[PDB]
Each structure stands twice: as C-alpha cells, then as structure tokens.
Design a protein around this ligand. Structure first.
Ligand SMILES: [Zn+2]
Ligand SMILES: [Zn+2]
Lengths: 152, 305, 305, 152, 305, 305
C-alpha cells in the first residue's frame, strides 16, 4: 500500500481519512481540532475534486467513530461534508455536519476585553442564525457573526 | 429550597420573571422589616478589581445591615496580587477558600463569569464585568420603578440619554421588557442612538415604541425617567446641541418621577432636585435594599416571607 | 497559663518544638470546631506597612471568623502617616494605645522586632520584616504538611525552586528541621543554589540530604513539594534552562502532594491543577486556620483544648 | 484511487506525500512549514512503521521538487527522513536532511526581550554544534540549544 | 514681495489657491535643489505645547536642512513655565522677543490664533490647535498628492477611515476641494460618517461624490488613498466589522497609490508595504519638503524661483 | 572606498581586527587634529529609545564637534510616538527618510538590528540593544587602553566586578581578545562569576588566564583596570563581603591605570581619584574621540589619513 484507502477499522482498530473537505480548509480542521494527537492512522490529499468522475458515490470526509456531532461542529467550516460507512454491508445513515449551537474551543471572541484571552478558558460561543449566523460569547455577552470570528 | 440559593448572580438577561418578582419582593419588607444577624458569622469578599465606590460603598453597607463582614479592596494603585504572571482565577480560587461570597468588580468583561468556573460553591455577585452587565444596578432600578408607579406592567417609560454606550438602559430595558405591553420612548440624539439589537427584540417579542428628540411631548404620557449621562468620547464641540438636558420647566407634569443611576452633572438641575419626579436619590437609597434581598437569598436556604 | 500568651510572634527560628506542635494542634480543630466570639470586643491592627494582600486578605478574614475587628491600611500611595520626619515607632506607640494586637508588614527588616520594644503589652504578629521572616507562612506550611503526610517525622521532602532568595524554604526547612531524620532534596540550578549556612546546620544537627537538577528521580522517594518561583533578578535570557518547571507527567507518582505559597505562574501547570499531589490551594485555605490558632492563643489565657 | 500513491508528477505536475516522518511530528512540518498553502495534491498517514516489512526499500518522506535544502532545514525535527525519486528509472541521489545553519522562520528566541516577538521579523537563528547543537539569534546575540527553543 | 511674508500660517481654510500652488512649488525644487544657509543666523522656536514627535521630529529637521536653529521643548511632564497662574500669552510675548519664528503645538484650539495677537511680527506655524487644524499636514498631503497623480485637478480620490473625528480629511478635502470637479468617495461606517457640513459645501460649491462601505469598487476608478485610523472612543466590541481595513488583494489595481498620515496599525498590511500604491512613507518624507518651503517663504523676502 | 562606509555599526563581535585598528587610529589624530565641518549639512538622529544621558550627552557633542546637527529625544515619559499600536520599525522607516544617520538606544535587544532591515541606506549606530551590545563603549575602552599602555598586544589586564551581568567586560574581553597572548584576571565573587562561554572561547582560541578574589597580587603583574559596578539584584545583605572595592592602598603599584565606564559609587575611592592609575575620566573624555572617528568614517567616503 503506496498511499490510498483500506478502511479496515470499525471498533478496536480505526482510521480517519479526511480527503480535502472543501479545499485547503480541512488542514485547518486537523488542528482546528485534535485528530493527530491520536493512535489510529490517518489519510488525506487534495481531490482538487469536482467530487467524483464516471459514477461518483455522492459523499466525502472521514470515517472512524468520531462521536455524533464530533461534527455538527464543523457545521461552520465544512457543512458540505460527510462521514463513515462500509462499501460491502455498512452503517453511517444520512449523516451531515448540521449546526451544533455552541462551538467549543475553536474560535475567539474578537472582543478585546473578554477575559477570554487573558486566561484558562474555553472558546464557548453560542449559535443562532436567521440573519446570516449569530455566535454569542458566554464570557462577554456579545454577538458577532460566523464572520469576523472565523479568522481571528 | 429557595430558587436563588447557591446560584451565582451575574446578568439580568440570565434571570427569570419570578426571580425578579422575588428579590423584588424579598426586598420590599426587608425594607419594612430589617434583620441584622440574618448573616452573622459571615465574612464576604468586597473585591474591587476596578475601584468604583458608589456601588461599593452601598454593596458593603448592605452586608453589614444584614449583620456580617468584609474584606476587600479597591484598586488601580497601591493594591497588589499577581500581575505580570497571575490569574484572576487563582485570585479567586484561594479567595474562594475562606470567603462565603464574592461581590467583585472589573474592567474586563468575563470575570464574574470567568470567576464562576473557578470558584466552586461560593456565589459571586457582579457589581460589573465591564461594559457588559450590572444586575445589581437594573434590579436596583427596576424595584424602585415599582415602589413608585406601583407596578412593572402598563407603563409609560422613557430613557433620554446616551442610550448607545448606555450601560443600564440596555439592562433596564430588557428587564423592564420581560414584563409587558408598555411602550418606550427614546429621546436620543442620533449618535447615542438605540442599538439595533435591543429592538428587533422589543419588536422580536410583541412590544412597542416611538422616537423623539424632545423631553417635551413624549412627556405627559410619561411615567418614570431614565436620563443617562452624555460625555467624552464625542467631541468637545460635540457638546453642541446638549439639549437633551433635564431641568425644571416641565409642569405639563403628571405624577411620574425622574431617575438617574448617578452621577448627575449637567443631565439635570438643582432647581428640579427639590420637587417631585425627583428621587434619583431614593433611587439610590433603594439599592441598599435591592442588594441585601439577594445576599440573603443568595446565602440563606429559606424565608420569613 | 498558655505558653503563647502576650508573647510576640516573629520568627520561626525563635520558636520551640512544643510551640509548633501547639498552634499546629490548636488549629487542627478550630478547623473542626470553629468559634466566632472567642474574640468579640476585640479590634486588631491590620497594618500594611507594605501592601501585600494575599497575606492580608487571609490574615484579616481570620480575625473575623474568630469574631472581632480591624482597622488597618495597605500602603505605597494614598496612605499617610509620618514621612520626612516620623518613626515607625511613634506609629506603633500610639497605635499600641487603642489596639489589642498588631499584624503588620514591611519593607525593612526589624520592624516587628523594632516595633516590639516600643509597643509594650500589645503583641505584634509579623506578616513580614522584609526578606527576613514570615512565621505565619511556614507554620501555615508546616501544618498543612501535617494534615497531609500525617506527621512532621520520617519524611521525604524536596523543595525545587529558587532556594537562594527563597524566603520560605529557609524557614520551612529549619522548622521542618527541628523535628527529625528526614532527608531533603534540593533541585536548584546552581545560582538559586542553597546557602551554605542553612546546611552546615542540617549537618550542624544530625540530618540529611542530597542534590539533583531533576524533579524526576528524587521523585518517587518523595512526599511533599515546595516548588518556589523563579524570576527577574537573573537575566531575561537567564530564563534559559527553566526546566525546573513542575508540570503533569510524573505518574511515577506516589500519594504525596505538591505545594507553593503562591503565586504560581510557570512553576506548575493547569494540567496538574486537577489531579492529586495538587493542594497549592488547600495549602492556602489552611492559612486561615494556622493564623486564627495563634491570635486566639496569642490573646486568650486558656483553652477548650 | 481510494487513498495511496501514484507519484505521477516530475515537472508541470507535482505531488508531496509526507507519510509520518518520525511520528506525530510531520504534522508539525506541515505548518512547521508551508506545504498546504499550494496547488499540488498531498498524501499522508501514520506508518506506525517499523519502516518496511518483507523487503523494505530503506527510505521515506516526500517527493516533489522541494528545492535543495527545502530541507536540511528539517535537519532539526526529522533528520532521519528522505526525499523523492522514481521506482522504474529515477533520480534523487543519496539525499538526507543535513543541517542548514540558520533555520529560518520556524522558532522563537525564548529570550523575552529580543525585538523578535514585538514586530515584523523573521525567526533567523544560526546553528553550530559540537556540544549538542547551538542556535544563535541574529537579533539578540544569544545562544540557546536545539532544545528549549524547539517547543516555544 | 512674496505673498507669504510675515503672514502667520494657521488653517488651510484660511489660504488661497495661489498660496497652495506656491508652497506647493517652492517645495518641489527645494526638493530638487536644497539650500542650507537660506536661514543661518536664525534660531526658531519648536514649542511643543503638546508633545507630538513625528510632527516635531520632521518640523525641526526642516529648520536645519535650511540651516538655522532650535530651542523648544515637548511637554506633559518635566516641562515648566507658568501653570496655576500664567498665560500661554505671556509665554509667547517673551518667547516672541528673541525668536525669529514659532512652530508650536497644542491641546486647546485657539493657541496659534490666540498666540497670533500677542506675538507681534514673529510668524507662528501651527503644528496643531487641537482637534482643529494642521495646515502643515494637509499641504504636506496635498503636494505629495501632486508629485504623484501629477495634478490636483481631475481626480479620483477616496478617503476610507474615521472621517468623523478624522482631523485631516476635513482639511484635505477642502483644499483638495478649492481646485476642481473631481468626485470623492467616502467609505465610512455610518458612525465615522461624514459630517454634514463639509458637504453642503462640496454641494455648496459645484462638486461631487458618492458613498460605499467597500474599498472594492470605488476602487478601480480610484487614484490616491487616505485610509485614516479607527480607535478607542467606539466600544472595544465596537471593533466589530473592522472591515474597512486596507490590505493586499486589490490587484484590480490601477497605478494610484495609498496614503496615511500615520501612524498605521491595523488600517493596512505589511503585505502591501512593499508593492506600489504604497508611499504612506514617501508621503512622510515629503513633509520635510512641504514645511521648509513655508519657513523660507515665511521668513525670506524673495526667491530663486 | 573606506572599509566603514554605509555599514551599520552594531556589535563589536561583528567587527574585524583592521576595523578596530582604524576607528582606533582615525580617532587618535582627530584627537590631535579636529575638523568641525567634516559634516556640516548633516542632521543626525539622537534617538533615545531608552534615555541614557551619559552616553547621549557624549554621542551628540560628538556630532557637533565634527560640525552637524541633531534631532532626538530621551524617553520614558512625556515622549510620544506609536504605542498600543505602532512599530519601532515604522518609527525608523520615516525617521530613516530625512535623517542622514541614527544613533539610537533601547530597552529590548534587536532594535539596532531590527531597525537595520527597515532603514535602507541610513546607517544606525547602537548606543545599546539592551543587555546585549554597546560597541561604542568597548571601542571607546579599547582605544583608551591604547593611548595608555601603548598597545593592545602583550598585556596584563584584569577586570574586577560583576563580570556576570557585566555588559562591557563581555565586549571588552572579546575585542581585547581578537588581538593576542595577554592573560586576563578575573577577581569575581563566585556569583558575578565569569560565564562559561566567553572562556571556552579564551580557551577556544589560544589564550590565557587565572582567577583570584584579591585586587592584590594579581596586581603588580597588572596593567589596566576594569572595575565594574556591583548592585541590586543580589540581596541587600548580599552586600556582605563587598571587598572587591578598589581604593587607595595599592602602592605595590606599577604605572598601569584604572578604568570604569562609570558611574562609580563604592567601587573606587575619591582618595584614589587624584593619583595616577586614575583616568576613569580620561577614559570618558576619550569616548568623544572614539565616536567621532566612526561617524566620520561611517558617513564620509575617504580620508586625510
Ligand atoms: Zn467574549
Ligand atoms: Zn533573540
């Protein structure tokens, strides 16, 4: 096996095989989240995709017993992605990163004063939308927008 | 057994009708029926991360009319601790240790929250995060509205000031708002305008309002007044049409009253002082009651209702 | 009738086994059995010749859990008195007058002593002379060692820090030393070395020890930890091999614990916080007990043992 | 191609296919250096290797027209690695990350005062060893050791 | 014989096309043709009623490239004079006495004028009144516009900043305005809006303009950029949509340039630095020429044109 | 055509025998043969990022004996610029612009270097980075050694002080070292010890030395003295065996001399002042020559050798 797949895992043995989610923002994720601080082996590249060629399944991402929303969590940086399963006989039913409501440690009150940014925290921001996506900041009760935040 | 127990108080938003109607009424009597020793054997923390004094001087006095203690400090100078190293969350974790409770004030804006987390079971009172929240103020304000007009229901309110950076009309409003159908008036000079969020919320909800740059008519169909302050920030030739000044000829009065979480300066005139609608003060003296209520709720388990 | 009566406390050196085993045990219960009013009718002096606050905030709280009073001040700024004229010994002689006792802290290093002389029968507590002595700290430390490992006898100690200007390992050591045969470890970077006097004394006596620059093995045959601080003074490129940092992977643990008369910064890691051997805090909360013990010894004549 | 290799590149078309250099410190590299801010596609995982099994070639890393020392540069974090070539007919002769003498932007005068750390710099440190590896800091003429630096 | 002689310079408003086209062109060569000694035997006053330094450091350097002298001071501290008694107009009347000329800067906003009156024949240069006028800046700015786009006629200007308290777009504008038909763009966040007076005047006159919150398109049909600063005053959660930041991807470039009477911070990016449209600097180095021109106009009687 | 041209001077390390033998000898005459106007038409920058004055007062005086200019500032107070935003490298890039050269001093330790990069062709002189380098000092020192003993070859040197944080024996040494076979003496109290790097280098090279805690014998086979200072940092009961004090009874003299880049305090005695081996001063007056040499090298293209 000169690079690829061989998604043999599923319990006591796992994989993860992020393959360019949207593009060049899946690296992010990587730090954006753990998932490299961890035993199981990993796999990626850049699909420079259009998706798939001849017949394209109609999905992508990672597969490896994340949790439930170990995601929902990406809802924000790669909403358009998709987890796990198996090609002959398999399980990971209609599962899409679907807004969490409270990103956790990834981000940063852009507010200059939040104590956030001064000590031993947690980024915890809460999410509401109808507008264009809203994020509050238990800390400094202030509201910024997926934007300007996403960056920082 | 009390709703309030060991709960940390920190943001008005984060509190429920009920709750308000409670500190609201535990303080009403306390006011008619004081108790020194409800608290004896208690010590509290009067942490003045950001010196403040009007607020501190009243907090405190509070601790002691209930009977009790203090240990605290005001800062920005000859106060120590950690600095170029230590965490407001090391301060607390130790503090936490001997104290029984913590009023505490600050420059930054998490602190009370930031301190919650690290201070296990020792409730924190927030005298201020920063430019964020002052629950004590607005409940202080809220009541007082109450002993006056005689209800927090079916009112004629108006808050003429610098509703923009206005720290307290922002709370007031949304507490005065939880209750219902009351119409608010906002005599603000398009610059101390009203932020477009506390509104979409008036709107958000089911509530109402209007705009004017007078103190005038808005004023006859009006019941309690919040004049904020007006200052720095804006030019000093920005104190151009400072016309939103409360003074004396209003007569086209009613039997309302005027308030201002001090400290007045220009906002309003000695001339007024005197005559009804005045109170800015009583408004103050009523914080000694508003606080207490809390602290004994905060720290006791039950009541002599 | 109590050994401690009207005696001024000021330097650990200047105190006897017994004595230690006493504040040591009057505080153990006090801790299990509090008394507000042992002291009522008392006022005390919380003199902060050199603002200090962690120490002050706990001293004080002490006065009041025992029931009592305060009057004091923290300085270096907006505090007055004599200056370009008056004597810290004029301050005292008057102070002396109304007070019942004096915790007091300072920059110079005689003060408590200097103040003894001039303050006739009003005991002084020393929160600090300067770079000299802090009895409260080390007895505070000493106990805490005790409620933990369960004795101040047949131990495995280690103090990794800046044992050079280290104010408290200097006391600790010589108190922890009066008791017996225990071996000490000194993980110090030849510069925060161990002074050649507190040794000749270990040696002086009949006691032991070893040296290492690890936190490692020294650590498995180890029971309580004193990590001091590390700072300024030395270059700022002198914080080169700052490797004497306590953090988290130790597992090759035991069931010991770690201490630090705060305030931590780099010394040790949040990561640790959590997990056993932690305590730096309890270590603190235990000063409120260690003090009290004194003050009521200091000022009462007898006990409810 | 479900994850792997297909090191078709070599000019107008390239790849990079870092495969766990030492372990869990090849992620590093990744940010440690660019190489993700870039077109060509990429490939990795964790060999959890012992190297190779039956017959193991006797090398690893990346292959993709780095430079010359686009490396030498790793000399410090994965000295034990190796570049490019081709399996039938190919070129990348005896090439090992071999000390540079001047790491560039990766690192950080641990000195607290270097202006480094206050403005628009460059980490530039120079390397000499016989001892156990020495790094100077054109900035604040001070000398620390691969250690304590490597971290920061 | 020179228009400019013994005239005190103080407010751009208060100056005539001509005049601009003059300092404008006396400095162009001066720049191509320096003269140290035009001024020898001169001393000048570098009065820094309000320390300022970028402005001072360049003023000065100016005096000396022309050959000459200085005597001055920067204040707010260890500087003296009258205070709790004396008048900035006693300072001057004496100063007036030995000097040959006065650059001078201040907090208040009359000073240069206030000082005119009292300083008989010794011209004053205004480095600043307060929040009022800085002629040196804007002519400094104006030129520089000139050596660039090659004229102060038939331009595409844009100034994206805090046009509200913006001290220099206020001058710039009205100087850039005296000349003609050029359209201005004002990418300002409704709060650093454009005051309704410098407009009625654009309008007032015969001139034009548009509004946008982009840096974008406004930008392709654009020739010189004034990005001001953005800061304090507004909340610190008021630095919310700070999107009016100049940075690097613009390409949809032209062959214009960017300016900023420093000092930049966030406004603009190192990244840019480099590449054309940059200059913020040259913009600066060009004040050493813009000033000089004046001072030798100011103080000589004629020219080597 | 001169080795030195447009080269920025900043660290003694970073300079070549030759070079030393040059400023060394351009200053020797300059000293015997002054030139005001070598520099006329020049302005320079006397940037005192960290006020310093002895060094500044002499730098400067330098500029002017050569004929020339200044514009500069000393800071820590009433000085401005950028702060809570701007870069010492924005300061420079503008400064860079009008100036002809930059002496500049600082707290941090890159600055001169950090400033090189951003200041294109305007040489920077370093009066100090921080705790890092002062070329001016040591060449200042170096010479002076020269006009004295009559060579920087086949000497008996000794530097008794606080060789640890000693800023200048660190330079001195390694310059005095480039030249050859001379043996150095280091009367340092194991704490102001000699760092183990400038040695391995003495050793490193081919050179020698010895150790002693006397001022005594080390002293008879001795030629120029560097006594540094001794202070703070260490306890204040750390000024215990302050026995490394130079004073008066030495007679077992020679015809050497004593130096100290001031300012003396305790190090050495009035008593001495007087009598030979004294010079600490001349040592100073000789910096006005040492600098100049540079600056005219630095800025001219050729010489009147
Ligand atoms: Zn926040
Ligand atoms: Zn450095």
């Amino acid at each position: 096996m000169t690079h690829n797949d061989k998604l043999q895992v599923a319990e006591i043995k796992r994989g993860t095989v992020i393959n360019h989610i949207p593009a060049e923002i899946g690296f992010k994720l990587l730090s954006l989240f753990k998932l490299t601080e961890t035993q199981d082996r990993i796999t990626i590249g850049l699909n420079l995709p259009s998706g798939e060629m001849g017949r394209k399944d109609l999905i992508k991402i990672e597969n490896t017993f994340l949790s439930e929303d170990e995601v929902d969590e990406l809802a924000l940086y790669a909403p358009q992605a998709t987890v796990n399963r198996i090609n002959d006989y398999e399980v990971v039913g209609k599962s899409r990163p679907s807004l969490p409501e409270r990103n956790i440690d990834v981000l940063v009150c852009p507010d200059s004063n939040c104590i956030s940014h001064a000590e031993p925290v947690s980024s915890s921001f809460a999410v509401r939308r109808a507008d264009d996506i809203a994020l509050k900041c238990k800390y400094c009760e202030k509201e910024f927008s997926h934007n300007v935040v996403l960056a920082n | 057994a009390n709703p309030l127990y060991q709960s940390h108080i920190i943001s008005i938003n984060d509190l429920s009708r009920d709750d308000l109607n409670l500190v609201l009424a535990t303080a009403a009597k306390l006011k008619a029926n004081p108790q020194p020793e409800l608290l004896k054997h208690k010590v509290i923390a009067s942490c003045f991360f950001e010196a403040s004094t009007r607020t501190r001087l009243s907090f405190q006095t509070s601790m002691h009319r209930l009977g009790a203690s203090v240990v605290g400090f005001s800062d920005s100078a000859n106060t120590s601790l950690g600095k170029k190293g230590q965490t407001l969350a090391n301060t607390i974790s130790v503090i936490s240790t001997y104290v029984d409770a913590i009023v505490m004030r600050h420059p930054q804006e998490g602190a009370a929250r930031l301190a919650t987390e690290f201070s296990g079971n020792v409730p924190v009172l927030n005298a201020g995060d920063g430019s964020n929240q002052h629950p004590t103020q607005t409940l202080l304000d809220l009541f007082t509205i109450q002993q006056t007009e005689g209800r927090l229901n079916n009112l004629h309110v108006a808050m003429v000031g610098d509703l923009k950076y206005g720290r307290t009309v922002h709370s007031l409003t949304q507490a005065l708002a939880k209750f219902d159908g009351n119409r608010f008036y906002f005599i603000a000079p398009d610059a101390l305008a009203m932020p477009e969020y506390i509104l979409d919320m008036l709107d958000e909800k089911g509530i109402a309002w209007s705009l004017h740059s007078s103190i005038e008519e808005v004023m006859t169909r009006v019941q309690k007044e919040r004049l904020d302050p007006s200052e720095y920030a804006x030019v000093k030739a920005q104190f151009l049409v400072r016309a939103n000044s409360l003074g004396g000829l209003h007569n086209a009065k009613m039997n309302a009253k005027v308030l201002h979480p001090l400290p007045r300066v220009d906002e309003i005139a000695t001339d007024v002082d005197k005559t009804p609608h005045a109170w800015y003060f009583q408004q103050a003296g009523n914080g000694i009651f508003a606080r207490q209520a809390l602290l004994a709720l905060v720290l006791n388990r039950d009541l002599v209702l």
